[PDB]
Design a protein around this ligand. Sequence first.
Ligand SMILES: CC(=O)N[C@H]1[C@H]([C@H](O)C(O)CO)O[C@](O)(C(=O)O)C[C@@H]1O
Ligand SMILES: [Ca+2]
Length: 217
Amino acid sequence: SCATGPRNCKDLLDRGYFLSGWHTIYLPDCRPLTVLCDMDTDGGGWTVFQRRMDGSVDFYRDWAAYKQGFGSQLGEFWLGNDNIHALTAQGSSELRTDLVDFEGNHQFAKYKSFKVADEAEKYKLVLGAFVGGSAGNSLTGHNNNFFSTKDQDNDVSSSNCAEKFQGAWWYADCHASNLNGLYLMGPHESYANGINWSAAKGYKYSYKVSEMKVRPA
Ligand SMILES: CC(=O)N[C@H]1[C@H]([C@H](O)C(O)CO)O[C@](O)(C(=O)O)C[C@@H]1O
Ligand SMILES: [Ca+2]
């Protein structure tokens, strides 16, 4: 039953699923999809669509890989651009970015709304107001940009940002954040090609953990 089933992780939390983990939800078109629910962070009910923790998974992937999703339920993944669109089409979803450095410090950024458009509009980022958080704001500067991968350049640069910079993102010319960049393990000498959130640790520090997640506003 789709119209009865959970639409997102907050629906699951409301029904007494108190531990984080993988659960089936029903997308707007009633397709079932297994997603990671973060029930532990900031009240819980978050649907996680990106997670890095150890560099075990290669994130320097093509349009196809990002479109469908890749990685492991047991570790690092990207849920998939088709999936992220479907998840964020209904209602208003807040975005939370959780970051952890190699010195064990947890930082976060919250945004009042977050939507990605369909493939026809290149999974364009539609981002609401920055709320706050220790990590600072490195995503507003990407608002209204298409998603790009190495093999499909939709950025606003004469260059290919995804190739630069070794990731996949709503690149502008080119980025303030690059959470799908190389897992560089803390400080790095290469410029802006790591898991970077520039408002916090700048362009030459690659985070240990990155998570991107959504909850009804
Ligand atoms: C990684 C990256 O793209 N860095 C570029 C940044 C970002 O676009 C930015 O800081 C947006 O917040 O802009 C510059 O500093 C700039 O044009 O002055 C050039 C730099 O190469
Ligand atoms: Ca370009």
